């Protein structure tokens, strides 16, 4: 046992030394001589109403026009943001929903939360009603995030310190991802749907291969829980938001933290994070009732989305980069552009 | 607009009407978060998430038991029912630390805790037996005496009353260490047979609402 611990410590020291030498320079001093974004002023082009409690999750559809919103009132609402219409009103079995997702095809939506079950709802079907299709059970802790890979594959993260891949038709766990010490709070699928990163309360981020099931990399740069994670549009990096009241941009091909976004007046934790189409603007949503537009390259607050009376819970972008959506505890979803 | 868009807008209006109806129906309920630990009767107070619904005086209460993130979920809840076991003294300090953590919880600064001390009968029996002494686990107990004018009992033992009041004083002065008056700790005693628990929770929720109203009016 003592020998095993000594070897573990030696390997950790070797990892730290190897990843310390590779850091020849820093992204901060590499991106100093560029054009700063300036002022990112965005206006609420649409404000969605109908949710009568805190909004916890929201996910855009593939067409950048249909979006699902899950709120503490216990209802999944599909919004047509172009005409602010309510395409569907999906009543959830459990009101303690903390995540929701939109199937890439658009035929299905996913919702999960404190019940440890990821419910799938069939949208496009005869009889003209959205109906429950499959209920994914097997996670031990609360569900933090869920994302579809296709019409039959969905990846979830739970509070039991694990992430899983599912076959919806069989409704069975195809792979279990292990190694996180704390609760896993966020997961982002890669653009190629081959890898995905996850951050947890252990103040670390881990990259997982969807097929093999092994942890290819593990990252540690936080001194508090990581609450949100988002993959870069390139797929070769990601960003994490923590209770530290700071964001951090990590890479995959260098295996160490690259950037940190923080402000002295910013002492509230980061609730949500997302990336624009270009990945130039890491948009974060905090507990101070506003969102910040952090230039991911320069780590500066180039903009603010201040129209929410309560904490910003969810923050996503359209697939075409034309609009952003923010849901807060004020029970209002807002499309900004 | 096109006829198709007009029909879509009509459908959206019907959906809005349904949402308003559901919210109107669901607005009246009062929520409660049940916290505690094992061997504490946490789930044995009233007769994913084991939500329970119960009514008193035409007021509906929704108690939620989960199984410390996710505490953010219960941020606008009426009260937190924090059950503790005061029969076994070794983990009494663990329960005190848990109460401290929950009481100083950033998300729960304005949430009044209805603190419950369970299985007081076992504590009284242990006091009578004398096998275990709280002084062995809390030396200050040896230097503690029950208040003269604040001991309303039904004819119980002074030793039992003194021990119970010592534990209650520890919990209460943890509560008031730094509260600022924005929330209060309501201590109570339960023996797993006392069915007058819903009444206590109702009275404490009424007191919490009253205190919030007075604070809004600055009367207190």
């Amino acid at each position, epitope marked *: 046992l003592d020998q095993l611990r000594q070897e573990a410590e030696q390997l950790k020291n070797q990892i730290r030394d190897a990843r310390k030498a590779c850091a020849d320079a820093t992204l901060s001093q590499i991106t100093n001589n560029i054009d700063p974004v300036g002022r990112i002023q965005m206006r609420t082009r649409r404000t969605l109403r109908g949710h009568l409690a805190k909004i916890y999750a929201m996910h855009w559809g593939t067409d950048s*026009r*249909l979006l699902v919103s899950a709120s503490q009132d216990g209802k999944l609402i599909i919004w*047509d943001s*172009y*005409t602010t*219409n309510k*395409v*569907h009103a999906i009543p959830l079995r459990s009101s303690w929903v903390m995540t929701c997702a939109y199937a890439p095809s*658009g035929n299905y939506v996913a919702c999960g939360g404190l019940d440890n079950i990821c419910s799938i709802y069939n949208l*496009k079907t*005869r*009889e*003209g*009603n959205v109906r429950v299709s499959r209920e994914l059970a097997g996670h031990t802790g609360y569900l933090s995030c869920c994302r579809f890979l296709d019409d039959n594959q969905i990846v979830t993260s739970s509070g039991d310190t694990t992430c899983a891949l599912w076959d919806i038709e069989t409704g069975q766990q195809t792979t279990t991802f292990t190694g996180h010490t704390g609760d896993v709070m966020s997961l982002s699928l890669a653009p190629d749907t081959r890898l995905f990163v996850s951050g947890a309360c252990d103040a670390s981020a881990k990259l997982w291969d969807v097929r093999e099931g092994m942890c290819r990399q593990t990252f540690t740069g936080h001194e508090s829980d990581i609450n949100a994670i988002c993959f870069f549009p390139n797929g070769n990096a990601f960003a994490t938001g923590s209770d530290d009241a700071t964001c951090r941009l990590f890479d995959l091909r260098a295996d160490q933290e690259l950037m940190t976004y923080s402000h002295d007046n910013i002492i509230c934790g980061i609730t949500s994070v997302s990336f624009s189409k270009s990945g130039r603007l890491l948009l974060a949503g905090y507990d101070d009732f506003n969102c910040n537009v952090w230039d991911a390259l320069k780590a500066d607050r180039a903009g603010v989305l201040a129209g929410h009376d309560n904490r910003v819970s969810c923050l996503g972008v359209t697939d075409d980069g034309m609009a952003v959506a923010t849901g807060s505890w004020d029970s209002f979803l807002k499309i900004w552009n | *607009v*096109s*006829a*198709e*868009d*007009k*029909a*879509a807008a*009509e*459908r959206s209006k*019907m959906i809005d009407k349904n949402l308003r109806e559901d919210g109107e129906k669901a607005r009246r309920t009062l929520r409660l978060l049940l916290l505690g630990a094992d061997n504490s009767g946490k789930s044995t107070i009233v007769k994913g998430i084991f939500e329970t619904k119960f009514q008193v005086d035409k007021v509906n209460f929704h108690m939620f038991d989960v199984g410390r993130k996710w505490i953010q979920c219960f941020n606008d809840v009426t009260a937190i029912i924090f059950v503790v076991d005061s029969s076994d003294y070794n983990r009494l300090q663990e329960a005190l630390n848990d109460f401290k953590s929950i009481w100083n919880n950033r998300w729960l600064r304005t949430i009044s805790v209805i603190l419950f001390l369970n299985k007081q009968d076992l504590l009284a029996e242990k006091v009578l037996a004398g096998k275990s002494k709280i002084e062995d686990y809390f030396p200050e107990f040896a230097r503690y005496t029950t208040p003269e004018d604040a001991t309303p009992e039904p004819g119980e033992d002074p030793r039992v009353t003194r021990a119970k009041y010592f534990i209650r004083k520890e919990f209460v002065d943890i509560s008031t260490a730094s509260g600022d008056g924005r929330h209060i700790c309501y201590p109570h005693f339960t023996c797993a047979v006392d069915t007058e628990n819903a009444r206590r929770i109702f009275n404490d929720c009424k007191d919490i609402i009253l205190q919030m109203n007075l604070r809004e009016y600055n009367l207190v």
Partner: single-chain antibody
Amino acid sequence: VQLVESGGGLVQPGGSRKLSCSASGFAFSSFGMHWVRQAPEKGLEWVAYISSGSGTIYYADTVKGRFTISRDDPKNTLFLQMTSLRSEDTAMYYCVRSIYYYGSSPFDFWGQGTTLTVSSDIVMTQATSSVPVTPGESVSISCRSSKSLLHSNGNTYLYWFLQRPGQSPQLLIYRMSNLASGVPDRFSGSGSGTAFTLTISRLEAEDVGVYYCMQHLEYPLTFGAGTKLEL
């Protein structure tokens, strides 16, 4: 999904009758309903329409004032009350379901009709009344409208239906570009402003009947003359 229709029968001119459409197999309450008749040998003619929640109703000027359209959602039924019947009201009547929201397919399901015998508007026409075809060939059927069916929202409101002998019309392409459910991929549609075409590649048996093109931009809903394909 079934829409069974009752009524019909012999009627003396100047009388009244009630047509019914009982629906079973879908969320009737969330579906709008339409009535479409077909003369003994002529094409199709829109009659009436009732919206979800009974909040919007439309009729046809040809029968406006004498017809009434209602619906019993809890009973899952659609009703058409007739009054002051005329000699031009002898036809076969059909009930159609159509739900309206983004990405939806109105006029998805038609039904078997009932025979009744008694003893301005946007215009689109079908130039060809008969077009012989051979199995395995490709057939293009085009039908043009009076004005542009393209709207500010980007939708071209043209719908295609096939009526095989002794059968009810069935939808093939909706909004001039989107396929339906249960229809083989061989059918397709396309076009631009006022120029609308429907292509069938690898024509096969069971694809013989009358093709009708309809518009939905604004009421009344007008049908084409009907292009008949024969072996």
